């Protein structure tokens, strides 16, 4: 149903080693479509998907221009933040910025975001109403005032409710084959001895899209979330994702247990059971 666009920007200073590293990437839902990476040869924004490569030559020039600007802005930011926190010249530091927007099934604006971090911690962010800031501390209250005076909120609200959404809706229709279709899990269950009197039952979800999935274990149709082991959802490297959930059990009890998958692509939920 819903969809989203997100741009992610990172800069890192290299205090005795020259210009800051800078990397930007943007995604629609879970599919990456572009990158820029200061330290690569071309110095252009590059395509990272097949459906975006069709875009006109003025797409790349502008995107390139704009992103080098974000870059020179993050570059100045690194110097100001060192100033504000009185940190030495000696150390390496990090800014990250994230923005974008979500839509519904009707493809209409739903929400937008703009969040900024220094050294991996909330610095300033834009609230849900789109009109005000949440400032993390006193250094950042200084920034909040500078952005209240330059009307940054209104300026981003106008990108978010306008340009972000229109161009998302666009990409959806152009990459519809890869962005609107939703791969259901190939599920499977393994069994291993871990000693004389115990056994591991691993529940596997493979080859699915999007990333949102839920795996749970039940003993006689009753949840039990401790004695489980669940790995972070991980990309397969070819568009799809993978995940597993395990549970250690007493030897001989394997059919007490059931695995439950929930995914967008599945209509009913799935139930698995050690049989093979």
């Amino acid at each position: 149903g819903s969809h989203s666009m997100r741009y992610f920007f990172t800069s890192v200073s290299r205090p005795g080693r020259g210009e800051p590293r800078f990397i930007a990437v943007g995604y629609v839902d879970d599919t990456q479509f572009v990158r820029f990476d200061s330290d690569a040869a071309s110095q252009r924004m590059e395509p990272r998907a097949p459906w975006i490569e069709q875009e006109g030559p003025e797409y790349w020039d502008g995107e390139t221009r704009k992103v080098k600007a974000h870059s020179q802005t993050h570059r100045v930011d690194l110097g100001t933040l060192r100033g504000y926190y009185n940190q030495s010249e000696a150390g390496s530091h990090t800014v990250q910025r994230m923005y974008g927007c979500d839509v519904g099934s009707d493809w209409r604006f739903l929400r937008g975001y703009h969040q900024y971090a220094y050294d991996g911690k909330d610095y300033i962010a834009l609230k849900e109403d789109l009109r005000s800031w949440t400032a993390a501390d006193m250094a950042a209250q200084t920034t909040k005032h500078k952005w209240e005076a330059a009307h940054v909120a209104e300026q981003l609200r106008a990108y978010l409710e306008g340009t972000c959404v229109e161009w998302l809706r666009r990409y959806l229709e152009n990459g519809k084959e890869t962005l609107q279709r939703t791969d259901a899990p190939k599920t499977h269950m393994t069994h291993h001895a871990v000693s004389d009197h115990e056994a591991t039952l691993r529940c596997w979800a493979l080859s699915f899209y999007p990333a949102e999935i839920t795996l749970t274990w039940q003993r006689d149709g009753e949840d039990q979330t401790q004695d489980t082991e669940l790995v972070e959802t991980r990309p397969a490297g070819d568009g799809t994702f993978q995940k597993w959930a395990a549970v250690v059990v007493p030897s001989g009890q394997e059919q007490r247990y059931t695995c439950h998958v929930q995914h967008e692509g599945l209509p009913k939920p799935l139930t698995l059971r050690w049989e093979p």
Partner: peptide
């Protein structure tokens, strides 16, 4: 696409 507006220094 990225934003031409409201990306100001801190």
């Amino acid at each position: 696409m990225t934003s031409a507006i409201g990306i100001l220094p801190v």
